[PDB]
């Protein structure tokens, strides 16, 4: 409804004056409820140098339910699977209306920097993250080269 659209427009304007991390986001064409985003691989993470694309769909009752957010670029990470689904609490149970798409992107950036392996979407990636960090980082760098450059 109209409340959602007002809030989406406000968050787009907010993002343009103050970009979260090194992210971009906004409408695909004229559709205010379907956005694209990009996140630069954080410096000093194994994703450094990659550019990762995401899709975002706002619900009609935004901001009182979360946007649906998924990666379209492949990424090696304990909380992001091969469909680009993102296991992140604020996109489900911990969403509230004081969150914004800028805060979602900052939280996804932090997630890339410091995973939640006890919340595994990809059990083996979670396991290697915990038991052999040097190997996790090697493989995440390899996948950044393969998919995100």
Omega before residue 63 within 30° of 0, cis:
yes
How buried is residue 1: exposed, middle or buried, by Cβ count under 10 Å (0-12/13-18/19+)?
Answer: exposed
Is 71 in contact with 47 (CB distance < 8 Å)? no
Instruction: Name the nearest CA neighbour of 86 among 102, 104, 100.
Output: 104
Residues forming the active site? 87
Report residue 107 CA to chain centroid gap: 7
């Amino acid at each position: 409804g109209a409340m959602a659209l007002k809030r989406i427009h406000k968050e787009l304007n907010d993002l343009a004056r103050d970009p979260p991390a090194q992210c971009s986001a906004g409408p695909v064409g004229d559709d205010m409820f379907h956005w694209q985003a990009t996140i630069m691989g954080p410096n000093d993470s194994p994703y450094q140098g990659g550019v990762f694309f995401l899709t975002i769909h706002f619900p009609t009752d935004y901001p009182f339910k979360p946007p649906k957010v998924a990666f379209t670029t492949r990424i090696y990470h304990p909380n992001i699977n091969s469909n680009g689904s993102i296991c992140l609490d604020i996109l489900r149970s911990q969403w509230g209306p004081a969150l914004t798409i800028s805060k979602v992107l900052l939280s996804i950036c932090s997630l890339l920097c410091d995973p939640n392996p006890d919340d595994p979407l990809v059990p083996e990636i979670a396991r290697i993250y915990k038991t052999d960090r040097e190997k996790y980082n090697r493989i995440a760098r390899e996948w950044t080269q393969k998919y995100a450059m």
